[PDB]
Amino acid sequence: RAVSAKKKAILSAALDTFSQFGFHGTRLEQIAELAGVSKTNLLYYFPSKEALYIAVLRQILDIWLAPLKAFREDFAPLAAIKEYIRLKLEVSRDYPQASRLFCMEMLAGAPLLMDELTGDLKALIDEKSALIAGWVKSGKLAPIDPQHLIFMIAASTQHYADFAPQVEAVTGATLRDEVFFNQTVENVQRIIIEGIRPR
Amino acid sequence: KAILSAALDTFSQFGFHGTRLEQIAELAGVSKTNLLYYFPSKEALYIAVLRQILDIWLAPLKAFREDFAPLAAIKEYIRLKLEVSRDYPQASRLFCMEMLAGAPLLMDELTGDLKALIDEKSALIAGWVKSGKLAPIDPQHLIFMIAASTQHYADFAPQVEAVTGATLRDEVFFNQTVENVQRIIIEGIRPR
């Protein structure tokens, strides 16, 4: 539908522009241009830059939360962990803009995202941490702290998007190279699962 | 050195564009014309600050030495990187932001020095792998993973604190953090 196509285009154009230039650096003229709509039209859907930035971040949180649902009581623990890693790397491959802007927002103190971090994201991480604790407690995983394990996977998988140019300077590849994508998944899993001490 | 330290604190608090030289001078306890004699513009002083932070950043990779046992080297690299996140979180953040979104001249310089040292230490780890002293893993991925994981405490501090209620300035949380990053990377989570 026309109305929804427009606002889908505004949100997507805004994500690209805000991650490229930051909040303060971004102007609404640009987002409108890229979305192929008038400014008054953009203002109709989103009555200020701050309103639109917020909607964008809410969309990014959703993208961000989704992978954690790989932590299910019905998956074998290592399959869950492998899937969480894979899903997170898919985010870095497919939504690097989102990953980047999320990074930029966190670096600024999370001035607009603090509420979400103390709410749903925390709730979800506490929930999955408890689940992993039970896998540890029952001997299906080695004795490790679940919060540190989740942060490590998050940090490691996100790095490939956020710092893709640095990774490319060193490796000669990005996650858009499917061989590099496969190697990356394989190595992050292999390191976290098997460890680097020989078995 | 007062101008450099004051500038680090201010640039990391307010960003490049947000920072004014008045403030740095104030905090350093010098006049502005004086600051301008040492550093001819805000950009010149910002660059010197980032170069100092790069040095702080590179130092931990020197824990990769041919004369360390491979796992001791890896443990020391992890520890040194967490010390940076504990002692220089502002710098870590300022650095991270500059690498994300800084001007390409400074960004080019910084990535080139990192690469150089990472190629060198990667080659060393490759040999530890090739000789069976480590499991078959890619050295570049291993270095990136440790860098990303240790830096996360500082760069994504607001999220870590929201979840944990702690920071690395709590020495018990610092010790827990070092032991877990090492335990996960070294031993893996699959039981042995």
Curated annotation (Swiss-Prot), chain B:
Pfam families: TetR_C_3, TetR_N. PROSITE patterns: HTH_TETR_2. Residues 1-57 form the HTH tetR-type domain. Keywords: DNA-binding, Repressor, Transcription, Transcription regulation. Coiled coil: none annotated. It comes from the Bacteria. GO terms for molecular function: DNA-binding transcription factor activity; transcription cis-regulatory region binding. Disulfide bonds: none annotated. Residues 19-38 bind DNA. Master transcription regulator which represses the degradation of pyrimidines (rutABCDEFG) and purines (gcl operon) for maintenance of metabolic balance between pyrimidines and purines. It also regulates the synthesis of pyrimidine nucleotides and arginine from glutamine (carAB) and the supply of glutamate (gadABWX). Homodimer. This is HTH-type transcriptional regulator RutR. It comes from Escherichia coli O6:H1 (strain CFT073 / ATCC 700928 / UPEC).
